[PDB]
Amino acid sequence: NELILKSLKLSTTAKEPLVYFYLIRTLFRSIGGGRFENLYKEIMPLLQVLLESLSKLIHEARRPQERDIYVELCLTVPVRLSVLVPHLSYLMKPLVYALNGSQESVSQGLRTLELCVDNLTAEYFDPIIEPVIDDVMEAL
């Protein structure tokens, strides 16, 4: 938790903030265990909202690689789906970006969508996907 919070805090003021996001991406990729999602549960909203803000307010400065990193962090959260049922609105926006990206991002987005459609009930999930259903279906 301390590492994640510090990484974000100096990412707010680093000369090249992408390095800290690379570190967080590596951490999420290489992490696995029962207690770590329990530790991420408390700090989920801050990370989600920060990734949302950076993803929406980026204009592809150097390449789309920063947006790719942001969406990969957003959809590669190690927590189980049961805890992740709330805050799904933060996940919905990067879904279209992932589905419109490269091969790995497309695969990650498709895996997230498959995990989402079957577990969640229709009446709960439908309003959440409604704002971006047209673009999601076009990309699909």
Side-chain angles (χ1 to χ4, degrees), residues 21-46:
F21 283 113
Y22 270 104
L23 197 151
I24 301 196
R25 194 193 69 159
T26 300
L27 167 57
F28 286 168
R29 179 175 334 267
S30 293
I31 193 55
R35 311 282 71 62
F36 317 133
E37 70 256 12
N38 208 299
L39 190 137
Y40 292 166
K41 153 165 78 201
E42 303 86 334
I43 68 150
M44 199 60 33
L46 282 72

Side-chain angles (χ1 to χ4, degrees), residues 41-100:
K41 153 165 78 201
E42 303 86 334
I43 68 150
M44 199 60 33
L46 282 72
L47 181 80
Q48 283 313 349
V49 65
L50 188 153
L51 274 296
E52 181 96 20
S53 290
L54 273 70
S55 179
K56 193 268 182 182
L57 260 53
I58 190 65
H59 55 288
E60 298 209 14
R62 313 145 193 86
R63 274 319 294 289
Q65 87 265 55
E66 57 267 16
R67 183 185 289 126
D68 189 358
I69 297 169
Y70 299 149
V71 299
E72 214 62 32
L73 276 296
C74 193
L75 304 165
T76 317
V77 173
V79 71
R80 308 164 285 106
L81 183 63
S82 67
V83 176
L84 189 60
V85 176
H87 322 99
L88 212 69
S89 178
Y90 302 115
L91 279 170
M92 279 316 157
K93 183 48 92 154
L95 194 43
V96 55
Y97 295 102
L99 260 60
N100 272 5

Side-chain angles (χ1 to χ4, degrees), residues 100-115:
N100 272 5
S102 89
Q103 179 162 69
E104 161 64 26
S105 66
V106 160
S107 180
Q108 188 49 243
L110 290 183
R111 187 194 276 100
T112 285
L113 194 44
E114 181 146 0
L115 183 63

